[PDB]
Amino acid sequence: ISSVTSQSVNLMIRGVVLFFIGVFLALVLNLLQIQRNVTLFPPDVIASIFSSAWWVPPCCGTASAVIGLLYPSIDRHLGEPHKFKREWSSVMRCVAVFVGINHASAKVDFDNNIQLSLTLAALSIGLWWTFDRSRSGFGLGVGIAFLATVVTQLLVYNGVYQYTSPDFLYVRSWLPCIFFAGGITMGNIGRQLAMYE
Amino acid sequence: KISRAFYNHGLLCASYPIPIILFTGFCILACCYPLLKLVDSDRKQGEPTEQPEWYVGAPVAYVQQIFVKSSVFPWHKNLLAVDVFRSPLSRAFQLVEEIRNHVLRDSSGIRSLEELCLQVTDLLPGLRKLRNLLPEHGCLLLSPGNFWQNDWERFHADPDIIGTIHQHEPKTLQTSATLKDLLFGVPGKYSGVSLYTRKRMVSYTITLVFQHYHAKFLGSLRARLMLLHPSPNCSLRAESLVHVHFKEEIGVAELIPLVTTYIILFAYIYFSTRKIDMVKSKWGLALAAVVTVLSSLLMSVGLCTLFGLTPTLNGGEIFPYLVVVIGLENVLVLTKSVVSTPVDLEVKLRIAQGLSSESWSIMKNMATELGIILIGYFTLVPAIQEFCLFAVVGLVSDFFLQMLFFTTVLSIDIRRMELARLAQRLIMAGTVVWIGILVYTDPAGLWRKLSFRHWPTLFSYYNITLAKRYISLLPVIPVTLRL
Ligand SMILES: C[C@@H]1CC[C@@]2(OC1)O[C@H]1[C@@H](O)[C@H]3[C@@H]4CC[C@H]5C[C@@H](O[C@@H]6O[C@H](CO)[C@H](O[C@@H]7O[C@H](CO)[C@@H](O)[C@H](O[C@@H]8OC[C@@H](O)[C@H](O)[C@H]8O)[C@H]7O[C@@H]7O[C@H](CO)[C@H](O)[C@H](O[C@@H]8O[C@H](CO)[C@@H](O)[C@H](O)[C@H]8O)[C@H]7O)[C@H](O)[C@H]6O)[C@H](O)C[C@]5(C)[C@H]4CC[C@]3(C)[C@H]1[C@@H]2C
Ligand SMILES: C[C@@H]1CC[C@@]2(OC1)O[C@H]1[C@@H](O)[C@H]3[C@@H]4CC[C@H]5C[C@@H](O[C@@H]6O[C@H](CO)[C@H](O[C@@H]7O[C@H](CO)[C@@H](O)[C@H](O[C@@H]8OC[C@@H](O)[C@H](O)[C@H]8O)[C@H]7O[C@@H]7O[C@H](CO)[C@H](O)[C@H](O[C@@H]8O[C@H](CO)[C@@H](O)[C@H](O)[C@H]8O)[C@H]7O)[C@H](O)[C@H]6O)[C@H](O)C[C@]5(C)[C@H]4CC[C@]3(C)[C@H]1[C@@H]2C
Ligand SMILES: C[C@@H]1CC[C@@]2(OC1)O[C@H]1[C@@H](O)[C@H]3[C@@H]4CC[C@H]5C[C@@H](O[C@@H]6O[C@H](CO)[C@H](O[C@@H]7O[C@H](CO)[C@@H](O)[C@H](O[C@@H]8OC[C@@H](O)[C@H](O)[C@H]8O)[C@H]7O[C@@H]7O[C@H](CO)[C@H](O)[C@H](O[C@@H]8O[C@H](CO)[C@@H](O)[C@H](O)[C@H]8O)[C@H]7O)[C@H](O)[C@H]6O)[C@H](O)C[C@]5(C)[C@H]4CC[C@]3(C)[C@H]1[C@@H]2C
Ligand SMILES: C[C@@H]1CC[C@@]2(OC1)O[C@H]1[C@@H](O)[C@H]3[C@@H]4CC[C@H]5C[C@@H](O[C@@H]6O[C@H](CO)[C@H](O[C@@H]7O[C@H](CO)[C@@H](O)[C@H](O[C@@H]8OC[C@@H](O)[C@H](O)[C@H]8O)[C@H]7O[C@@H]7O[C@H](CO)[C@H](O)[C@H](O[C@@H]8O[C@H](CO)[C@@H](O)[C@H](O)[C@H]8O)[C@H]7O)[C@H](O)[C@H]6O)[C@H](O)C[C@]5(C)[C@H]4CC[C@]3(C)[C@H]1[C@@H]2C
Ligand SMILES: *[C@@H]1O[C@H](CO)[C@@H](O[C@@H]2O[C@H](CO)[C@@H](O)[C@H](O)[C@H]2NC(C)=O)[C@H](O)[C@H]1NC(C)=O
Numbered sequence: 099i100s101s102v103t104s105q106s107v108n109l110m111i112r113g114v115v116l117f118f119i120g121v122f123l124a125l126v127l128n129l130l131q132i133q134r135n136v137t138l139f140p141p142d143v144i145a146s147i148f149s150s151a152w153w154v155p156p157c158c159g160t161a162s163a164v165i166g167l168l169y170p171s172i173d174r175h176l177g178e179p180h181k182f183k184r185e186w187s188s189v190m191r192c193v194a195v196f197v198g199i200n201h202a203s204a205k206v207d208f209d210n211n212i213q214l215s216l217t218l219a220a221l222s223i224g225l226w227w228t229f230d231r232s233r234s235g236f237g238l239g240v241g242i243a244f245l246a247t248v249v250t251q252l253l254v255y256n257g258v259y260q261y262t263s264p265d266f267l268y269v270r271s272w273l274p275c276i277f278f279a280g281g282i283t284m285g286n287i288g289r290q291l292a293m294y295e
Numbered sequence: 296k297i298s299r300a301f302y303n304h305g306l307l308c309a310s311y312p313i314p315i316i317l318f319t320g321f322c323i324l325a326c327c328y329p330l331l332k333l334v335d336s337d338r339k340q341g342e343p344t345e346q347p348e349w350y351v352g353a354p355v356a357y358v359q360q361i362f363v364k365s366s367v368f369p370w371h372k373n374l375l376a377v378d379v380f381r382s383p384l385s386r387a388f389q390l391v392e393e394i395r396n397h398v399l400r401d402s403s404g405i406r407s408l409e410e411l412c413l414q415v416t417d418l419l420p421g422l423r424k425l426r427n428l429l430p431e432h433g434c435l436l437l438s439p440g441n442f443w444q445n446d447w448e449r450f451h452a453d454p455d456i457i458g459t460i461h462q463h464e465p466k467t468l469q470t471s472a473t474l475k476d477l478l479f480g481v482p483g484k485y486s487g488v489s490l491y492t493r494k495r496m497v498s499y500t501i502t503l504v505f506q507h508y509h510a511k512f513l514g515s516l517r518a519r520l521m522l523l524h525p526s527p528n529c530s531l532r533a534e535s536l537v538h539v540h541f542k543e544e545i546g547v548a549e550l551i552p553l554v555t556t557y558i559i560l561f562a563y564i565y566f567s568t569r570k571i572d573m574v575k576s577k578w579g580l581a582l583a584a585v586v587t588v589l590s591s592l593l594m595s596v597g598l599c600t601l602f603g604l605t606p607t608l609n610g611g612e613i614f615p616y617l618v619v620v621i622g623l624e625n626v627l628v629l630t631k632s633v634v635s636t637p638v639d640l641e642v643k644l645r646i647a648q649g650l651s652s653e654s655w656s657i658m659k660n661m662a663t664e665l666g667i668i669l670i671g672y673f674t675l676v677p678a679i680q681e682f683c684l685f686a687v688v689g690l691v692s693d694f695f696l697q698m699l700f701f702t703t704v705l706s707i708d709i710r711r712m713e714l715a716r717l718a719q720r721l722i723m724a725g726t727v728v729w730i731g732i733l734v735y736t737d738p739a740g741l742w743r744k745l746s747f748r749h750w751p752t753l754f755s756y757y758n759i760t761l762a763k764r765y766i767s768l769l770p771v772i773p774v775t776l777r778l
Contacts, residue, residue, distance in 0.1 A: 126551060126552050126555050127552070129548050129551055129552060130552045132549050136419075136421075136755045136756075137420075137421040138421045138422075138424065138471070138756075139465070139471070140469075140470065140471050143547065143548070146546065146547075146548040147548050147551070185566070185570075186562075186566045187563055187566040187567055190559055190562050190563045190566065191563065191619055191620075191622070193559060194556070194559050194560070194563070194615070194616065194619040195619065197552075197555070197556065197559070198616050198619075201552070206676070206678065208676070209675065209676070213674065213675070213676060216674075217674065220670075
C-alpha cells in the first residue's frame, strides 16, 4: 500500500506546490494596479501587499490545483500525454506572457471594439498555437474562462467586485482572455511537473 | 540555392574572426553609451531672497509659520500643562482675532486676510474624525485653539484638555505624523515641550497660506508685533527666501511586480543552458549566447532612442519581455547542429556544413517573427506601434550579429579544443557590460528642523498634490514672561 500512497503523495504534492504558485501570482497581480488611496491612517506596508482578505488567494490557488491536476489526467485517460515544447523554458515563457498581458490589462485605452477583437482573438489563439496544440486543453480553457466570466458577471450582481459604470464592457471583453491564458499556463505547468516521474 | 551563402560565410568568419569581434563589441559600446547615464530654469530648490520674486511658477503656494515661547519662574507652584498653556492661548486668541480682523490700509484700502487668503471648502471624505477641527467657512489659518472652533471661552472654561488633545494620537513613528503636532507646530520632542518643573518652554506653531505676497501688508503687520511681542531677542536677519522642493515617493509594493519579471527571466536562462551542459564543453560556451541576444536588445535600445522614437517608454519594464519572446533556441538549433557534425579538421568546414544546412530554417523563423510584428505595427494603437519597433530592431540585430560574434566564438573555441586567450577575456568583458546595463535598470526606478512630511498631507486632504509645486517660508517671533 506504500506505493499507491506514494503516488497520492506525488499527486497532491504537486497540487500544494502550484497552489502556493497561484497564490504568489494573484498577490503580485492584484498589487500591480496602483490605486491612489490618500486617506488618513495611510496603509501599513504589509496591508498594501496582503490586500483584500483570506477570501481571494486560497480560491485562486485552488483553481490552479484543479487545472494542473485536470489537464494531464484527461489526456492520460483519453489519449497520449503531451510532447510539443514540454521543457520548463517554454513554460516560463508562457508564464511571463501571462504576466505581461495582465500588465497590459489596465495601462491601455482602446479606440474601437474592432481593434480589440482583431487583436485579442489572434493573441489568445497564438498562446495556444505555441505552447500546446492539443485541441483538448484548448476547448477546456475556453470553457473554464467562459464560466469564470459568467460567475463573475452574476456574483457582483449580489456584489463582490463593487464597480458599476459604462465600463461594464471591460469584463465582457478583456478578462476571459486572462483566464483563458491562465488555464493554458497552469496546464503546461501540470504537464512539466507531472512528467518528472 | 542559398546554403552556398552561409557556406562562404563560415569561410569568411573563421578567416577574419577578431576584426568582426572588434566591430561588434565596439558597436555594442556605441549603443550602450547613453542610457546608463542619460522652458523652466530650475524646478528644484532655488532660494533667492525675500526682497525678490518667485520663479513665477503656480500651483506653488507658500505658507508662513510663527514661533512663540512662554516662561514661568524657575520657581513656581502647580506647574501643569493646563495653566502654563492657557495664558499663552489667552493671548493667542486675542492675536488670532486681531489678524483675522486685521484692519489696515492695504492695497485695497481697509483690507483683511480673507481678500487673498486661500478661500476653499473642499472637505474630502475621510475628514470624519475631524469634522470640527479644520476651518470650512472660508479661511486657511491653523492654531491649537482650532480644535475648539475658535472658542477661547470653552478653552478657559473646560475641565481638562491634555487628554482631549491626546485624543487623536494613534501610535508612534508613523509616516503620517498627526494633527496635534501640526496645530502645535513645535514638535513636543524636538521643541522639547514636556511637563518638566523649573525647566519648561511651551511653544505654539501658527500656519497661514496665500497666493500673492504683498509685504505692504506684512511689514505693517510686523509694526504691530514689535509692540505686541516685546520679547528679548536679536533675531532679524535680512532678506533670504527658501523654496522647499516637493519630492514624490514611489512606495515599495508599487515596485514588486517588475522585480518578479526579472526573477522569471533568470530562470529562462538557467534552463536554456542545461540543454548545453549535456555536450562535452565548458560552461562559458553557453555564456557566449547569453551575452549576445541581450547585448542585441540593449544595442537596439540605443538605436531606438536616439533616432528620437521612444518618448514614452523605458527598458527596465519591457526589456525582459523581449528576451522572453525572441528567445535563444534561435542560436542553439544551430549549435547542436554544429557539434552534431563529424569531427573533422578546419572547423571552417564543419560549420559551413551544418550552419549552412540550418540557414534555411533560421530565415523561415525570422520571416515568421517579422510577419507577426508587422501585423502589430499595422495596428493604429500607438503604444504598440512603439514596442513593435523595439522588437523589430532587436530581432534584426540579433540576426545580423549572431552569425558574426557567436559564430566566431565557436570557431576559436573548437580550435583551442580539438587542438588542446582574448576569447574568454572578451567574453567576460561583454558579460560585465551586460551586468552593467542590468544594474542600470534604475531607468524605470524613477525651519528645516520640521518633519520629513505633513506639508503635502494638508494638500493631500483637498484633492490637490503639491509634489510638482514648491513652497516658501518666512518667519516672525512673539514671546512672553511673568509669575
Ligand atoms: C487562474 C488564476 C487565478 C488568479 C487570477 O489569475 C488566474 O485570476 C485573475 C483575475 O481574477 C484577476 C482580477 C480581475 C479583475 C481585475 C480588475 C482590475 O480593476 C479594474 O481596473 C480597470 C483598469 O482599466 C478598471 O479601472 C479603470 O481603469 C481605467 C484605465 O486607466 C481608468 O482610467 C479608470 O479610472 C477612471 O477613468 C475615468 C475617469 O473619468 C475617472 O475619474 C477615473 O476614476 C479606472 O476606473 C476606476 O478608476 C479609479 C481610479 O483609478 C478606481 O481604480 C476605480 O475603482 C474603484 O475606486 C473606488 C475609489 O473609492 C473604490 O471605492 C472602489 O472599490 C473601486 O472599485 C476604478 O473603477 C476597472 O474599473 C477596475 O475595476 C484590477 O486592477 C485587477 C483585477 C482585480 C484582477 C486582479 C488579478 C486577478 C485576480 C487574476 C489572478 C492572478
Ligand atoms: C503580438 C503580441 C501581443 C502581446 C505582446 O507580445 C506580442 O505585445 C507586447 C505589448 O502588447 C506589450 C504591452 C504594450 C503596452 C505597454 C504599455 C506600458 O504602459 C506605459 O507605462 C508608462 C510608465 O511610465 C506610462 O504609464 C505611466 O505610469 C506612471 C507610473 O505608474 C503613472 O503614474 C502614469 O499615470 C498617471 O497616474 C497619475 C494620474 O494622476 C495621471 O492622470 C496618470 O496619467 C502613467 O502615465 C499614463 O499612462 C497612460 C497609459 O494609457 C497614458 O499614457 C497617459 O497619458 C494620456 O493617456 C490618455 C488615455 O490613455 C490619452 O488619451 C492621452 O493622449 C495621454 O496623454 C499617461 O499619463 C505610459 O503612459 C504607459 O502607456 C506598459 O509599461 C507595458 C505595456 C503594457 C506592454 C507590456 C508587454 C506587452 C503586453 C507585450 C506582449 C508580450
Ligand atoms: C478564448 C477566447 C475568449 C475571448 C474571445 O475569444 C476567444 O471570445 C470572443 C467573444 O466572446 C468576443 C465578444 C463577443 C461579444 C461582443 C459584443 C460587442 O458589443 C457590440 O459591438 C458592436 C460592434 O461590433 C456594437 O457596438 C457598437 O460599437 C460602436 C463603435 O464601433 C458604437 O458607436 C455603438 O454605440 C453607439 O454608437 C453610435 C452612437 O450614436 C450611440 O450613442 C452609441 O450607443 C456600439 O453599440 C452600442 O454599444 C453600447 C456599449 O457597448 C451598448 O451596448 C449599446 O446597446 C444598445 O442598447 C439599446 C437600448 O435600447 C438596444 O436597443 C440595442 O439593441 C443595444 O445594442 C450598443 O448599441 C453593438 O452595439 C455592441 O452591442 C463588443 O463590441 C465586443 C464583444 C464583447 C466581443 C469582445 C471580444 C470577445 C470576448 C472575443 C474574445 C477574443
Ligand atoms: C471557474 C472558477 C470560478 C471561480 C474562480 O476560479 C475559476 O474564478 C476566478 C475569478 O472569478 C476571480 C474573481 C474575479 C473578480 C474579482 C473582483 C475583485 O474585486 C476588486 O478587488 C480589488 C482589489 O484591490 C479592489 O478592491 C478594493 O481594494 C482596495 C485596495 O486596493 C480596498 O481599499 C477596497 O476596500 C476598501 O478599503 C477602504 C475602505 O474604506 C472601504 O470601505 C473598502 O471598500 C477594495 O474594495 C473592497 O473590496 C471588498 C472585498 O475585497 C468589498 O467588496 C468592499 O465592498 C464592501 O465593503 C463593505 C465594508 O463594510 C463590506 O461589508 C462588504 O462585504 C463589501 O462588499 C470593497 O469596497 C476593487 O475595488 C474590487 O472591485 C476581488 O478582489 C477578487 C475577485 C472576486 C476574484 C477572486 C478570485 C476569483 C473568484 C477566481 C475564482 C477562484
Ligand atoms: C477632484 O477629482 C475630481 C474627479 O477626478 C476632479 O473633477 C473632475 O475633473 C476631471 C478632469 O480634470 C474629470 O475626470 C471629471 O469629469 C471632473 N468631475 C467633476 C468636475 O466632478 C477634480 O478636478 C478634482 N477637484 C479638484 C479640486 O481638483
